[PDB]
Symmetry: C2
Subunit: 98 residues, 2 copies
């Protein structure tokens, strides 16, 4: 259970879009959080993996307003670490989110 | 095992941590956010876990996570006073 959440989040950490796809293609909840309330989109945005953020936004359609332990959404990490291609994507996706 | 460590720290599972330390796995290994077992345990305020990590395993209390934060920083933010005192005394004596 939590073993997969970490495989999921470690796949987002490495920029492995294919591994994320295999997780998503098995009906796994892609919005699950870890011990720090961090999601796959959190780790992707913090690392600046533009293609990983794209997949979680377009293919999985994950909630971008999920807050971690410190109350931050994935956009906050992209802003703090100067990943602006991810910032612009999360900006546009947050204004249209459902 | 990379986070079975950190999932045990989050849940205050001192017994699981003792089993993992016996198998000689790295108790200071970090995750995707550069978080250690001491980080998560201090953030949750689980006192018996940070006791075991500093007194038995003697982990480095100056390890910084992705946000440059020390395990004591989370314990201060979330009002885990006894954990703050343990790490503060341990950080002073760290060789």
């Amino acid at each position: 259970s939590m073993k997969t959440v970490v495989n999921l989040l470690f796949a987002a950490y490495s920029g492995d879009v294919s591994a994320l796809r295999r997780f998503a293609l098995s009906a796994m909840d892609m919005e699950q959080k870890d011990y720090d309330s961090r999601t796959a989109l959190h780790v992707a945005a913090a690392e600046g993996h533009i293609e990983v953020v794209k997949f979680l936004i377009e293919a999985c359609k994950v909630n971008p307003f999920a807050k971690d332990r410190w109350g931050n959404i994935p956009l906050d990490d992209a802003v703090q670490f100067n990943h602006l291609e991810v910032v612009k994507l999360l900006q546009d996706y947050q204004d249209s989110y459902t």
